[PDB]
Structure formats: C-alpha cells, structure tokens
Design a protein around this nucleic acid. Structure first.
Ligand SMILES: [Mg+2]
Ligand code: NA
Ligand code: NA
Length: 325
DNA sequence: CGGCCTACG
DNA sequence: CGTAG
DNA sequence: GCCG
C-alpha cells in the first residue's frame, strides 16, 4: 500500500465503508476545531481503507498500512470489537459538532463564520434568519435555498442541466465545449452540486467567455443566485410541476490548460491534495489547475491529456472512477 | 521536529 | 472572509 | 495524527 492516495486506485464503492465513515467523522470534527493536520491524517487513513481489496476483519490487518497509528488503529479496533467507537459517537451527538456541521453546510458560511456564530450562542437556521442584517448576500441565498440544496442531485438532473448550459455556451461562443467534472465524472450517481468545465479548441477564444455565458443563463431565468473564470451559481432546475434550486459551478480554461483543469476539477479533493503534495515533495514539480511547473528549469509542461500529466509525474494512470480517494 | 495543496471570487 | 476539486 |  503506497503512502500517497494518487499512487493507488480508489473505487467509488469498496469493502470498508463503515470504518472509513467513522474516521471521516473524526476528520470533519478536527476541521471544525481548526486542526488541518489531524483532519488530513484521518482523511488519509480513511482513504487507505477504501483502497483495500477486502474487508478489514482483524486489527492485525492494519499492520504496515500507512497513516494508521495508535489513534486511528484504536478507532478501528473498537469498531471491530463492539460495532461502535465511543469517541466517534461522542462527536456525533455533540452540540458543537452538530451545529458546526449545520452552519458550514450553508453556502457562504465557512468554519470561521460558523465558529463565531457558535460562540455567540446561535444554534439553528432560524436563529440565523432572525438577524438577517448580520448576513452577506451570499449567505442569505444559501439560507433561503438551504432545504433544496440539502436534497441530492441525481444523474438525471445533471443531463438536463448540461443541455441548458450548452445552449447558453453555444450562443456565447460557437464551438465552445462543456465537460462534466467533479464527482459525477468519477461515477457518482448523486451529489450535492454539478461541476462543469468549459473551453474552446482555438487558444484565446475563451477569453471573456464566462460573463457572456452568465448573462445568457440569467436572461433565460435560470439563475437564482450568482455573484472571471469560476462562477458559483444556484440554478433553477425543472421538476414535475415545479422546480428546485441546485448548486452549479462553471469554470473556463484555455485549451492549453484544459488537461490540468480537467484533472483538478475531477478530484476527489483528497486525491488532488495528495497529487499536488506528491508532485512537489517527490518530484520537485509544482502542480495546480493551470499547469505543472519545473522550478529549476523555470518551464511549464505542455500536456494534451490527463494521461500526459500522470506520465510527467511518473505515476500509473488512473481513470476518474479510480480517483475516489 | 516541519509539513500538511493551491488556486479564484 | 467566502468558494472549488 | 502521522510520516519522513
Ligand atoms: Mg462537486
Ligand atoms: Na459553507
Ligand atoms: Na462544485
């Protein structure tokens, strides 16, 4: 088992779901307390279990696995022996965890805002609604739409959204293309938002594209909220006899950068953090969603595909459905 | 012990 | 500060 | 919290 998540296939479904879920609760709780290091370790340990070929049945099977030390091993041991881990259950039922989870789920609210509200004594969404001047426009939209945004987006919803995005993109710039990214590109059947990447085969033609796309979607009445190359939107999606709000992200990249942007926006989040960590620490190359830089030659790698990027970094290629770290 | 991804709005 | 994978 |  290699130590970086980008060095191993991780499928969407696996053989250690309960164990990974428990470690991810502790990762989430670490993040609510501002402990990014502990968050990363628990995320990585969870991800190692997702990559195993069969269920962990005995504590012995953790020996040698990366990111399993005393703490993560104890969590697993308690789950194997008793079916529950006391620490995990204490987190789950804690007022702090539940409220921080509720507040940070709001579009426009991060850990720092949620924590301040928590320390002020706020606990529920209606608490927030009763003092609306205390909220940004973005937070107001996130609160108004919170119920719809909590409802899973289905793959059927995604196909409908992609056609309407393509129509606006085609008027904004004939020849521009729309690619589904994020979790749905990794094979998820549901999700909490839809991610699209837009480019044009003629380098430079994509300049100024996103405003033109946004104005066209808004003129079609489809945009419930929007605030450039990244747009974080709430879209009106038709439903039987009505509609629902859906989070949609639209990103533009020049075709020279498209493989990097595709790689970055396909995720998973942990996969990409691990890939960038691997690039820099193991290969001395600096990776982002725009390119891959050699800081000794002061040159950027040209890539025509995701396959090119994995080759550059000396990694076996993983298709999107094996990037579910 | 230092490090923990790296951007854009 | 928020957002994204 | 863990790795190197
Ligand atoms: Mg997504
Ligand atoms: Na949020
Ligand atoms: Na998104």
């Amino acid at each position: 088992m290699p130590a970086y998540a980008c060095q191993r296939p991780t499928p969407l479904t696996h053989h250690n779901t309960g164990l990974s879920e428990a470690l991810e609760i502790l990762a989430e709780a670490a993040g609510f307390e501002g402990s990014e290091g502990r968050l990363l370790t628990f995320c990585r340990a969870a991800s190692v279990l997702k990559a195993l070929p069969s269920p962990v049945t005995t504590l012995s099977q953790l020996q040698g696995l990366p990111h399993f030390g005393e703490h993560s091993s104890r969590v697993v041991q308690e789950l194997l022996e008793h079916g529950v881990c006391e620490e995990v259950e204490r987190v789950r039922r804690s007022e702090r965890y539940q409220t921080m989870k509720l507040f940070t789920q709001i579009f426009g609210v991060g850990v720092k805002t949620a924590d301040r509200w928590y320390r002020e004594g706020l606990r529920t969404l209606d608490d927030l609604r009763e003092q609306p001047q205390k909220l940004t426009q973005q937070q107001k939209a996130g609160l108004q739409h919170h119920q719809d945004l909590s409802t899973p987006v289905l793959r059927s919803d995604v196909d409908a959204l992609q056609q309407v995005v393509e129509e606006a993109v085609g008027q904004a710039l004939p020849g521009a293309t729309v690619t589904l990214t994020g979790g749905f590109r990794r094979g998820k059947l549901q999700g909490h938002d839809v991610d699209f990447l837009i480019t044009h085969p003629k380098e430079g033609q994509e300049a100024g594209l996103l405003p033109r796309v946004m104005c066209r979607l808004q003129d079609q009445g489809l945009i419930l909220y929007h605030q450039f190359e990244r747009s974080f939107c709430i879209f009106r999606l038709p439903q039987p006899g009505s509609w629902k709000a859906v989070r949609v992200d639209l990103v533009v990249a020049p075709v020279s950068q498209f493989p990097f942007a595709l790689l970055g926006w396909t995720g998973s989040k942990l996969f990409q953090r691990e890939l960038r960590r691997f690039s820099r620490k193991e290969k001395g190359l600096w990776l982002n969603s725009h390119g891959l830089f050699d800081p000794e030659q002061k040159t950027f790698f040209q890539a025509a595909s995701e396959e090119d990027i994995f080759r550059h970094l000396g990694l076996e290629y993983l298709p999107p459905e094996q990037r579910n770290a």
